[PDB]
Amino acid sequence: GSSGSSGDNYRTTGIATIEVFLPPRLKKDRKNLLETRLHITGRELRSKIAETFGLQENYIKIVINKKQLQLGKTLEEQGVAHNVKAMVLELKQSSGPSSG
């Protein structure tokens, strides 16, 4: 429903290269780099990568520094700088409440 917000012309770009490491299942190409801002919420990432590689966002989890991506914290908050690395993990069987 309608699209188009914010603008720019001349101003430093708060972009940051991210290294996405897909599992030995998809295999698309060498180390995949993802260019994104830092202001974006960690959640946006988990979603970005997904959409990016058309993968799933509700079925994946980023990992950085043998830690988990803090979707509740901004890339900057958690501590995501430029030229960083990230791992793509696949959630486990999610049963939860039966579907009716």
Domain at 71, CATH number: 3.10.20.90
Tokens 């180390």 sit on residue = 31
- How many angstroms from the chain centroid is the CA of residue 94? 21
* Residues forming a β-bridge with 87: 21, 63
**How many Å apart are CA 47 and CA 57, to the nearest integer?**
5
Which are the contacts of 15, defined by CB distance < 8 A and separation ≥ 6? 35, 36, 37, 82
Range of the domain at 100: 1-100
Report residue 69 as tokens: 């991506």
- Tokens 């801002």: give the residue: 37
Alpha carbon distances (Å) from 63 to 9, 19, 24, 67, 72: 34, 11, 16, 6, 14
Output the DSSP codes for the chain. --------SSS---EEEEEEE--TTT--SSSEEEEEESSSBHHHHHHHHHHHTT--STT-EEEETTEE--TTSBHHHHT--SSEEEEEE-PPP---SPP-
Residues pairing with 34 in the sheet: 18
How many domains, in total, are found in the chain?
Answer: 1
The answer to whether the CB of 29 falls within 8 A of the CB of 19 is no
Structural method: NMR
By residue count, the chain amounts to 100
